[PDB]
Design a protein around this ligand. Structure first.
Ligand SMILES: [Cl-]
Ligand SMILES: [Cl-]
Ligand SMILES: [Mg+2]
Lengths: 9, 203
């Protein structure tokens, strides 16, 4: 399965 | 860019469907580099574009020609393939459906998120718009891959302003910019000072 990303802001 | 013509007039390229690259000036921070695909230009605010950047799951709204944080904006001649999707039928019925979308943690354990499939994305039409009950911003994924792997299970106010009551006690103002066609009570909202696209049922 996909992994959740860290995202800016 | 916006090209002065001159005093009251400016011209611009039609960039919907185009590949772009530009720098972004983080506030008091370094310049970051970005490349992506312009998906749409918002009718109620034609200087606002919706963009999908390579390697970044959220769909962003930026005023590409006016926002001063954008630099060295390059519109590429690259032609995005108009693919005829694996299964148009399977894609089209997926729209407007509540879903359970499996992700996995660093821990390797399962993490299942309730979501709603909103639409097939413009331009990159094998991709889908999706939002999540616990994370109500606009995301974009090749969900047919998730579906076939078994990681996805299936179950106007535009133009008006909105105010959101922040936990601070502050108030965030935004504009309703889009009505979801498969679900007209659900809308995209752009808040000032935030480049995410928020997705809420306004009923
Ligand atoms: Cl959930
Ligand atoms: Cl739609
Ligand atoms: Mg659950």
């Amino acid at each position: 399965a996909r992994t959740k990303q860290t995202a800016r802001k | 860019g916006s090209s002065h013509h001159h005093h009251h007039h400016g011209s611009r390229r039609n960039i919907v469907g185009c590949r772009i690259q530009h720098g972004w000036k983080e506030g008091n921070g370094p310049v970051t580099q970005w490349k992506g695909t312009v998906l749409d230009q918002v009718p109620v605010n034609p200087s606002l574009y919706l963009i999908k950047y390579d390697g970044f799951d959220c769909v962003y709204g930026l005023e590409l020609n006016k926002d001063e944080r954008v630099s060295a904006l390059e519109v590429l001649p690259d032609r995005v393939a108009t693919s005829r999707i694996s299964d148009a039928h399977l894609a089209d019925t997926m729209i407007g459906k509540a879903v359970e979308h499996m992700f996995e943690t660093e821990d390797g354990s399962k993490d299942e998120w309730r979501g709603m499939v909103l639409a097939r994305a413009p331009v990159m039409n094998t991709w889908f718009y999706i939002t999540y009950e616990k994370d109500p911003v606009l995301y974009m994924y090749q969900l047919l891959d998730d579906y076939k792997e078994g990681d996805l299970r299936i179950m106007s106010l535009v133009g008006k302003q909105v105010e959101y009551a922040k936990e601070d006690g502050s108030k965030r103002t935004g504009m309703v910019i889009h009505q979801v066609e498969a679900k007209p009570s659900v809308y995209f909202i752009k808040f000032d000072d935030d480049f995410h696209i928020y997705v809420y049922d306004l009923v």
